[PDB]
Design an enzyme around this catalytic site. Structure first.
Site, mmCIF file in Angstrom:
data_model
loop_
_atom_site.group_PDB
_atom_site.id
_atom_site.type_symbol
_atom_site.label_atom_id
_atom_site.label_comp_id
_atom_site.label_asym_id
_atom_site.label_seq_id
_atom_site.Cartn_x
_atom_site.Cartn_y
_atom_site.Cartn_z
ATOM 1 N N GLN A 1 0.815 -1.208 0.000
ATOM 2 C CA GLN A 1 0.000 0.000 0.000
ATOM 3 C C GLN A 1 0.849 1.257 0.000
ATOM 4 O O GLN A 1 1.831 1.359 0.739
ATOM 5 C CB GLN A 1 -0.915 -0.007 1.234
ATOM 6 C CG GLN A 1 -1.964 1.087 1.260
ATOM 7 C CD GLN A 1 -3.268 0.701 0.562
ATOM 8 O OE1 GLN A 1 -3.685 -0.471 0.549
ATOM 9 N NE2 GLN A 1 -3.950 1.705 0.016
ATOM 10 N N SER B 1 4.091 -6.396 3.433
ATOM 11 C CA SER B 1 2.682 -6.470 3.885
ATOM 12 C C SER B 1 1.783 -7.090 2.810
ATOM 13 O O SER B 1 1.799 -8.315 2.657
ATOM 14 C CB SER B 1 2.219 -5.066 4.334
ATOM 15 O OG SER B 1 0.868 -5.143 4.887
ATOM 16 N N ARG C 1 -8.913 -9.157 2.764
ATOM 17 C CA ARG C 1 -7.983 -8.544 3.717
ATOM 18 C C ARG C 1 -8.221 -7.031 3.805
ATOM 19 O O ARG C 1 -8.348 -6.462 4.906
ATOM 20 C CB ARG C 1 -6.545 -8.863 3.273
ATOM 21 C CG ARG C 1 -5.465 -8.475 4.282
ATOM 22 C CD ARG C 1 -4.100 -8.825 3.641
ATOM 23 N NE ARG C 1 -2.956 -8.529 4.499
ATOM 24 C CZ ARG C 1 -2.214 -7.437 4.398
ATOM 25 N NH1 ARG C 1 -2.532 -6.475 3.512
ATOM 26 N NH2 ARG C 1 -1.144 -7.314 5.221
#
Length: 314
Positions: free
Chosen positions: A12, A91, A116
């Site tokens: 992200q 991540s 998620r």
């Protein structure tokens, strides 16, 4: 089989409107990768990436980024790139690594990281969580600050990403994150708020992680064909049971990226290719003492240049 080269997959924040658009005009395999992931999910991921509509909402960001990463992976292998010795991803990128390594199919993983993202978005009420970067302090010092503020009862705040020595992202209750930022500055460090609202990789995510684990536990996973250094421990799983356990613990525990890059270097890795949009993990990797060079493969020219340089060094 490249002996001195590892691939890293971003998470992200590496997304950007218009990403891969030039590379998709020239290579039809990019649009094919996006159509395959979009079929799994039931909505158009390429449109999100190219319009930006919804791109920054993490339930969309995560499957868009994982798809982009796998598109570039497929192109690299198609254009004759060597297979890296190790994989690691930050991540969301851990799931991208597991797809690249044959541990999960593109379709299963794009669904999983869509879930998620949904669960992360709902973990705390809007505005109640935050993340910030603390710059200039050792890991243990950031931990101590976070532990002390957390002890004041006003909320929870924890080290969430160890990204490089001197660069630690914290996460938790908004006021507690603000308090650590203030104390870091009072103690002559730097601190900036990040543009997220989800306090990832801290204990506020544990309920969302419990929900996600139920789905993860029933997902098909195989051991990767290239070893994957995982975020929760900077370690490489011996079992599928260990691989699953490290995935299940990942969302609410710190991302051990500094130790991941240390481990890669301690294995003779000297070149890093960032297999995804942007240069975030590249810039975390140039300044490392045993990393000769780091490449992003974001564009036509970046891809061939990285293809060349890795083939030369190997």
């Amino acid at each position: 089989a490249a002996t001195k080269t590892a691939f890293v997959f971003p998470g992200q924040g590496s997304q950007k409107v218009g990403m891969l658009a030039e590379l998709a005009e020239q290579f039809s395999g990019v649009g094919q990768t996006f159509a395959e992931a979009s079929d799994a999910l039931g909505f158009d991921l390429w449109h999100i990436a190219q319009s930006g509509e919804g791109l920054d909402q993490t339930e969309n960001t995560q499957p868009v980024l994982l798809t982009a990463s796998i598109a570039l992976w497929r192109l690299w292998l198609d254009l004759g790139g060597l297979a890296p010795k190790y994989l690691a991803g930050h991540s969301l990128g851990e799931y991208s690594a597991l797809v690249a390594a044959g541990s999960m199919s593109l379709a299963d993983a794009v669904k999983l990281v869509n879930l998620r993202g949904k669960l992360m978005q709902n973990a705390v009420p809007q505005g109640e969580g935050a993340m910030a970067a603390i710059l200039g302090l050792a890991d243990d010092k950031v931990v101590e600050l976070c532990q002390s503020v957390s002890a004041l009862g006003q909320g929870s705040v924890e080290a969430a990403n160890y990204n490089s020595q001197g660069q630690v992202v914290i996460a938790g209750s908004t006021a507690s994150v603000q308090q650590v930022m203030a104390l870091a500055k009072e103690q002559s460090a730097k601190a900036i708020a990040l543009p997220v609202s989800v306090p990832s990789h801290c204990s506020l995510m544990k309920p969302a992680a419990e929900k996600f684990a139920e789905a993860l536990e029933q997902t098909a996973i195989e051991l990767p064909t290239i070893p994957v250094i995982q975020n929760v421990n900077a370690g490489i799983a011996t079992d599928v049971a260990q691989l699953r356990q490290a995935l299940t613990a990942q969302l609410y525990q710190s991302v051990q990226w500094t130790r991941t890059m240390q481990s890669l270097q301690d294995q003779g890795i000297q070149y890093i290719v960032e297999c995804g949009p942007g240069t975030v993990l590249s810039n975390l990797a140039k300044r490392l003492p045993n990393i000769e060079k780091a490449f992003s493969i974001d564009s036509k020219s970046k891809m061939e240049d990285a293809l060349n340089a890795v083939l030369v060094a190997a």
